[PDB]
Symmetry: D2
Subunit: 115 residues, 4 copies
Amino acid sequence: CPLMVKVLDAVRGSPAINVAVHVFRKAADDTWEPFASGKTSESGELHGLTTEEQFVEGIYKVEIDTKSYWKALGISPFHEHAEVVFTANDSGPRRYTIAALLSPYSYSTTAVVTN
Amino acid sequence: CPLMVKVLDAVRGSPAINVAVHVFRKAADDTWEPFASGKTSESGELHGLTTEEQFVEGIYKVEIDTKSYWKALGISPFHEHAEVVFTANDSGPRRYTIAALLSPYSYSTTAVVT
Amino acid sequence: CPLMVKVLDAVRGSPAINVAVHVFRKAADDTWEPFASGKTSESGELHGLTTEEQFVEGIYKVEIDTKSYWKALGISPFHEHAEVVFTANDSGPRRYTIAALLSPYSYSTTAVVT
Amino acid sequence: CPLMVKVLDAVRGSPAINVAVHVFRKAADDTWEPFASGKTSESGELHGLTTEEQFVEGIYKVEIDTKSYWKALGISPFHEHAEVVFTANDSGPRRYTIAALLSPYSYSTTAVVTN
Ligand SMILES: C[C@H](C(=O)O)c1ccc(-c2ccccc2)c(F)c1
């Protein structure tokens, strides 16, 4: 599990459940090709997105569908979605945990990188 | 204006208005003595808390009554309040801006010292 | 000034100066077309990106070149950049302030719409 | 484990290790009496602070010694520490996860409350 995503809800003090997450990898032609996708679990986490073998060096984009999440709660959010773009494995294989804390008009994201 | 406080609402995407703010200075006996207080304006800001002469080196605590703010909106918040404790260094011309971004179960605070 | 961007540095407790910001508007063919760009000032702010007349309803993307900012400080950041994608509603007099707080491996962004 | 604290480092993209945490409970005389304390582990977490039986309703304060953490890294931080004050178990026993994301001049804290 080299790539993990965790999403929390700052309004309800709970994990953000059933949040759609799409991951893309920048292709040779500078285009974003689908890499993996999923929905956060009851704990606000998304595991099994990829494997060490498939997760090669490159630029990846993790898109979190925050809009659909807030609309389902009856809240009109500011952002269309939350995006996290980063170069991965440039100096060897690493484990990445992408965390996002969501509010209707704000979000924070941090990364925890392990060897 | 050596010290300024700004509070934003992350739920409504607006300044946090009429939020009570209390500032304290740590006294010689390690006790918190009232220093200044006020309520954020329409722009979520609070100015004129103190002056350069009065704002001497020391440890200060800025307490933001976040609980009352959320209750007024019909939301049961997690925190009793938000506190920011810092040491005013004074070493060189410095203005302190304490910013807080509020959500019912979360808050972030940052300091901009220029 | 319908749209304003403010960037702060959470590591140095100061405004993030000379940060490149690019704004795009989603075109009819679902493509991002350049809309406006600039660099944050000494106060970490970027004004005069657009006008009320030009800033019509639509989906906009604000891209903050955070990577170049950290590299200039000798720090290897995590993100390639920070992006804020939002729909300008226009329904009623509204000014948009996009604020970003930057750290090497984290950033927070909030919108203050008044 | 009704009370858990997790601390992350936003500057290094890693858990904040060996961070001292002190917990207090507001006493009848409006005084803060020591309740529990510990240091974050290699994963930035602190477990076993208290038990369901001991964690009764009341106002608690979780103090995270962020200053010592940054000084050990050679960084002069803004805050003396980070404090989280909340009423707990007022409507029955709950599980609380207090998370903090640290930067020299900024910190964010969120709570995840479970039944
Ligand atoms: C991944 C981890 C978890 O949920 O256990 C986690 C997730 C989010 C935060 C976090 C807390 C406050 C502001 C920004 C991020 C954090 F400090 C730790």
